[PDB]
Symmetry: C2
Subunit: 127 residues, 2 copies
């Protein structure tokens, strides 16, 4: 599998993606169902169900019968913070002059590998 | 598991890391053994052996009895190119003003999520 540090960083990125996904789903279609999450992640339903229980254990999500998944106050803030980091990187790349599509693409995959000091540096760039 | 596009990007990053690792090992200790590769990757020996056969099939590596693993001309160039991309990102972050340690860290994890247009933009930055 791998070094503890790397697995822990990978777990963190998964958590962020899951809570951002849930918020985006509620915001776009009004609900976040397990089947829709699975389809939008590209994974089976069993693995989504598996991650949801981990999230509940971390007090990040609440599951309601016939209504799907929702975020808790802690989970919604976590999603807001991830989104914010992705935006800082995206805006930085836009200031650099990268096409809007590519800027948004790279920012999504890059953010999780950007240290805090680097993100600050990106933010710094006002121009 | 996931979307084809994502799995293919992940496979690519693994290939680069493996060939860079092999070149770095030969350069630092004169040889690249499976047990040392496994230990330095944080994975078991079975998975390294598994990836090595995939690399041989791609004509990227050659395995020699009692001598370990070596790269082919194609494999050595692939490693040189990965290293180069990591360097472009690292230098870019240094120009930005990020500490040497963090610059090298983020560049390693970032490069695989940086599109070509973005890398050019990074290179562009001369300052």
């Amino acid at each position: 599998e791998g070094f503890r540090q790397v697995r822990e960083a990978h777990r963190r990125e998964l958590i962020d993606d899951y809570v951002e996904l849930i918020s985006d789903l509620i915001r776009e279609v009004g609900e976040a169902r397990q089947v829709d999450m699975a389809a939008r992640l590209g994974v089976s339903q069993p693995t989504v169900a598996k991650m949801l229980k981990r999230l509940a254990t971390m007090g990040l999500i609440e599951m309601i019968p016939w209504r799907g998944v929702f975020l808790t106050a802690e989970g919604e803030k976590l999603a807001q913070e991830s989104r914010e980091r992705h935006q800082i990187v995206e805006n930085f790349l836009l200031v650099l002059g990268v096409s809007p599509e590519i800027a948004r693409r790279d920012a999504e995959g890059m953010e999780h590998h950007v240290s805090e000091e680097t993100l600050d540096a990106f933010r710094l760039f006002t121009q």
